[PDB]
Fold:
Amino acid sequence: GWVRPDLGELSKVTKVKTDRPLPENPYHSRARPEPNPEAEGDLKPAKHGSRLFFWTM
Amino acid sequence: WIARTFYDGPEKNYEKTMAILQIEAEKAELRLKELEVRRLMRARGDGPWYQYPTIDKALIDHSPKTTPDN
Ligand SMILES: CCCCCCCCCCCCCCCCC[C@@H](O)O[C@H](CO[C@H](O)CCCCCCCCCCCCCCC)COP(=O)(O)OCC[N+](C)(C)C
Structure:
């Protein structure tokens, strides 16, 4: 009582019911380095201007 | 009459010199601090400056790759 699969059937994406636990770290990755402090605040005018040699602005 | 018509009291020049000295001392302190901060950031690389680019992580394709072991 075997029915031959039709065209387009064996190439389907199916689903599997399994009791195997999903690996949390399959890549064996290390701990990622901490990012930069990503500073945030309110801009204020540069203190005493450019401060380049004799320039006052 | 010359002092009344053309010149000003000593206090004006005194206090103006105090203000000028304050401003320029602050500027010198800021210049030293800028040099030190630049040295530290360039040595460490943990600040906003001297951040050289790296490969974006949004470019990596996370999909089965025709082979289980990537
Ligand atoms: C018997 C008398 C003996 C003494 C004679 C004294 C004569 C003085 C002549 C030489 C003076 C030189 C000028 C000295 C100062 C000029 C620059 C500056 O310091 O003065 C300015 C002011 O200058 C004067 O307004 C103008 C002086 C111009 C003098 C010109 C004299 C010669 C003119 C010749 C013209 C001839 C006629 C034309 C013929 C064709 C700014 O003063 P100001 O910031 O306000 O002062 C405020 C003081 N407070 C704050 C205490 C109130």
